[PDB]
Design an enzyme around this catalytic site. Structure first.
Site, PDB file in Angstrom:
ATOM      1  N   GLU A  67       0.761  -1.240   0.000  1.00 12.35           N
ATOM      2  CA  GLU A  67       0.000   0.000   0.000  1.00 12.35           C
ATOM      3  C   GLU A  67       0.794   1.293   0.000  1.00 12.35           C
ATOM      4  OE1 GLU A  67      -3.176   0.191   2.615  1.00 12.35           O
ATOM      5  OE2 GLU A  67      -3.396  -1.972   2.903  1.00 12.35           O
ATOM      6  N   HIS A 107       0.922  -2.371   8.087  1.00 12.65           N
ATOM      7  CA  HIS A 107      -0.143  -2.412   9.084  1.00 12.65           C
ATOM      8  C   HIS A 107       0.225  -3.325  10.224  1.00 12.65           C
ATOM      9  CE1 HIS A 107      -3.653  -0.239   7.636  1.00 12.65           C
ATOM     10  NE2 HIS A 107      -3.262  -0.556   6.415  1.00 12.65           N
ATOM     11  N   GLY A 108      -0.450  -3.134  11.351  1.00  6.95           N
ATOM     12  CA  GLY A 108      -0.188  -3.987  12.494  1.00  6.95           C
ATOM     13  C   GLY A 108      -1.307  -3.950  13.517  1.00  6.95           C
TER      14      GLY A 108
HETATM   15  C1  LIG Z   1      -3.248   0.763  11.889  1.00  7.66           C
HETATM   16  C2  LIG Z   1      -2.003   0.649  11.026  1.00  7.66           C
HETATM   17  O1  LIG Z   1      -1.321  -0.352  11.113  1.00  7.66           O
HETATM   18  C3  LIG Z   1      -1.616   1.750  10.015  1.00  7.66           C
HETATM   19  C4  LIG Z   1      -0.072   1.944  10.056  1.00  7.66           C
HETATM   20  C5  LIG Z   1       0.416   2.949   8.994  1.00  7.66           C
HETATM   21  C6  LIG Z   1       1.962   3.056   9.062  1.00  7.66           C
HETATM   22  N1  LIG Z   1       2.517   3.922   7.998  1.00  7.66           N
HETATM   23  C7  LIG Z   1       2.775   3.283   6.811  1.00  7.66           C
HETATM   24  N2  LIG Z   1       2.573   1.992   6.690  1.00  7.66           N
HETATM   25  N3  LIG Z   1       3.210   3.966   5.819  1.00  7.66           N
HETATM   26  N4  LIG Z   1      -2.290   2.996  10.386  1.00  7.66           N
HETATM   27  C8  LIG Z   1      -3.441   3.411   9.766  1.00  7.66           C
HETATM   28  O2  LIG Z   1      -3.970   2.779   8.870  1.00  7.66           O
HETATM   29  C9  LIG Z   1      -4.100   4.694  10.245  1.00  7.66           C
HETATM   30  C10 LIG Z   1      -4.600   4.409  11.693  1.00  7.66           C
HETATM   31  C11 LIG Z   1      -5.261   5.627  12.342  1.00  7.66           C
HETATM   32  C12 LIG Z   1      -6.674   5.644  12.581  1.00  7.66           C
HETATM   33  C13 LIG Z   1      -7.281   6.778  13.194  1.00  7.66           C
HETATM   34  C14 LIG Z   1      -6.483   7.899  13.571  1.00  7.66           C
HETATM   35  C15 LIG Z   1      -5.077   7.886  13.337  1.00  7.66           C
HETATM   36  C16 LIG Z   1      -4.467   6.753  12.725  1.00  7.66           C
HETATM   37  N5  LIG Z   1      -5.227   4.988   9.328  1.00  7.66           N
HETATM   38  C17 LIG Z   1      -5.029   5.723   8.193  1.00  7.66           C
HETATM   39  O3  LIG Z   1      -3.938   6.183   7.882  1.00  7.66           O
HETATM   40  C18 LIG Z   1      -6.200   5.998   7.251  1.00  7.66           C
HETATM   41  N6  LIG Z   1      -5.711   6.780   6.110  1.00  7.66           N
HETATM   42  C19 LIG Z   1      -7.376   6.794   7.935  1.00  7.66           C
HETATM   43  C20 LIG Z   1      -6.890   8.187   8.399  1.00  7.66           C
HETATM   44  C21 LIG Z   1      -6.517   8.411   9.757  1.00  7.66           C
HETATM   45  C22 LIG Z   1      -6.056   9.691  10.174  1.00  7.66           C
HETATM   46  C23 LIG Z   1      -5.965  10.758   9.236  1.00  7.66           C
HETATM   47  C24 LIG Z   1      -6.340  10.543   7.883  1.00  7.66           C
HETATM   48  C25 LIG Z   1      -6.798   9.267   7.466  1.00  7.66           C
HETATM   49 ZN   LIG Z   2      -4.206   0.724   4.603  1.00  8.89          ZN
END
Ligand SMILES: *CC(=O)[C@H](CCCNC(=N)N)NC(=O)[C@H](Cc1ccccc1)NC(=O)[C@H](N)Cc1ccccc1
Ligand SMILES: [Zn+2]
Ligand SMILES: [Ca+2]
Ligand SMILES: [Ca+2]
Ligand SMILES: [Ca+2]
Ligand SMILES: [Ca+2]
Ligand SMILES: [Ca+2]
Ligand SMILES: [Ca+2]
Ligand SMILES: [Zn+2]
Length: 432
Positions: free
Chosen positions: A152, A211-212
């Protein structure tokens, strides 16, 4: 950004829960033996019940002491033993080292040996001492790395890179530095077996971007239940982990990070020597910048910002993240938690040996001791059963150690010399 220094004369305080007080001696002795002044403070002696506010206050107090030489703090216990600082949306150990400047740039490196049993602690101590003291030219697993990436991400990520492109840039940097083998496990298709095989084959560095969950990696699906399959006995990598909650050590079961730090096989340490993982959900782009800088510092790309400890490498890498992402970056830094010894001297390649020439004896009235070493930058230290008598850095081929006390009462002294990517030298000095 302005780096936080690994003060040459810095000291460390190990804050240990009372029930582990009698089990940390060997660790404390080794740190003093290699030249890092280390003291112990029993958590319940700070306050009982132990609270986050008390720990925070204690560290500030110790940091303010004349000199401000406090540089590392190691917490020994799980959350129930020594709590993390908890505020809405934040679970943090890193905050204990944020003392000056009304900002999130740490003054002190923080790390934790999360344990729920005596053996959890014993294995984290042993793996750390072995890593700094016992690695030889035959530990061929060093200089080999594993890069893991989800399928991704994209143009909106840090520097517009998908996780795969991000990890490829890291792999090129590691190769340029000297790593001899880079293993790439990129989705789609990564399975637990791929990760287990990589660890068991021998690696000294892992970079994960994806992700994790609290107990596993989204790419590979490798988790706490697979840790028992690792047999990388004392062939331990450290990990820069970009993922949500892999470091939530307040979870009802051991989190991903804790399982790797506590893993053992027939009494020998397996898993990791250190890992930095988040207690909360991580934003997509900010941690990417932090991970990049950690690797740039590890590969000595910034000549005036050299960091030899796991704490120094990771914290300074995170400063770059705060600088570029501000508020979002600060929340990530506060929660990106170090599991393991923050003072850990990292190893990147198979070590070479040092030529150390020192007198076989020392006068019982001596004030100084001169050691010859063909590696400038090595740290030479004299000690007596965990009691550091003097330490110095090798310059122009020699170290002039000034004794901090009389040795007229001693019969033997231990000389310990450590150096970056070098085999540790230990010699005896007879006191005449
Ligand atoms: C949960 C994870 O494992 C994921 C890790 C990303 C690590 N960086 C890279 N792999 N490049 N994190 C998310 O998916 C993230 C989790 C989140 C949820 C709610 C608030 C803050 C973080 N979710 C996202 O990035 C989505 N794009 C949704 C989102 C969240 C916050 C701002 C904008 C979009
Ligand atoms: Zn994702
Ligand atoms: Ca600060
Ligand atoms: Ca057991
Ligand atoms: Ca990148
Ligand atoms: Ca899965
Ligand atoms: Ca825990
Ligand atoms: Ca950089
Ligand atoms: Zn050993």
């Amino acid at each position: 950004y302005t780096p936080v220094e690994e003060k040459e004369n810095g000291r460390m305080i190990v804050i240990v829960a009372k029930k582990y007080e009698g089990d940390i001696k060997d660790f404390v002795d080794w740190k003093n033996q290699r030249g890092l002044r280390t003291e112990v403070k029993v958590a319940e002696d700070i306050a009982s019940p132990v609270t986050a506010n008390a720990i925070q206050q204690f560290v500030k107090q110790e940091y303010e002491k004349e000199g401000n030489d406090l540089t590392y703090v190691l917490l020994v216990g799980d959350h129930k033993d020594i709590p993390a600082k908890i505020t809405p949306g934040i679970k943090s150990d890193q905050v204990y080292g944020q003392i000056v400047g009304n900002d999130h740039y740490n003054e002190v490196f923080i790390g934790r040996f999360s344990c729920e049993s005596k053996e959890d602690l014993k294995t984290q101590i042993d793996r750390t001492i072995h890593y700094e003291r016992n690695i030889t030219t035959e530990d061929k697993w060093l200089g080999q790395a594993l890069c893991i990436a989800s399928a991704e991400g994209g143009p909106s990520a840090d520097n517009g890179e998908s996780d795969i492109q991000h990890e490829n840039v890291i792999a090129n940097l590691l190769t340029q530095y000297g790593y001899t083998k880079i293993i790439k496990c990129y989705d789609p298709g990564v399975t637990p077996k791929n990760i287990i095989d990589a660890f068991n084959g021998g690696i000294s560095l892992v970079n994960y971007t994806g992700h994790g969950s609290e107990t596993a990696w989204g790419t590979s699906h490798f988790g706490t239940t697979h840790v028992k399959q690792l047999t990388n006995s004392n062939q331990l990598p450290f990990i820069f982990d970009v993922a949500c909650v892999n470091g939530d050590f307040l979870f009802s079961m051991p989190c991903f990070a804790e399982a790797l730090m506590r893993a053992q096989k027939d009494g020998k340490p397996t898993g990791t020597v250190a890992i930095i993982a988040s207690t909360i959900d991580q934003y997509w782009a900010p941690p990417m910048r932090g991970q990049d800088e950690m690797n740039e510092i590890l590969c000595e790309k910034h000549p005036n910002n050299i960091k030899r400890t796991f704490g120094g490498v990771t914290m300074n890498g995170m400063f770059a993240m705060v600088e570029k992402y501000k508020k979002d970056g600060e929340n990530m830094l506060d929660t990106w938690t170090v599991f393991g010894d923050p003072s850990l001297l990292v190893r990147t390649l198979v070590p070479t040996e040092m030529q150390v020439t020192a007198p076989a004896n020392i006068s019982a009235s001596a004030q100084t001791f001169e050691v010859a070493c063909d590696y400038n930058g090595a740290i030479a230290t004299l000690s007596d059963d965990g009691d550091m008598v003097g330490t110095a850095i090798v310059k122009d081929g020699k170290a002039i150690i000034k004794l901090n006390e009389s040795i007229a009462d001693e019969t033997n002294l231990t000389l310990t010399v450590v150096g970056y990517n070098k085999v540790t030298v230990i010699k005896d000095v007879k006191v005449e």
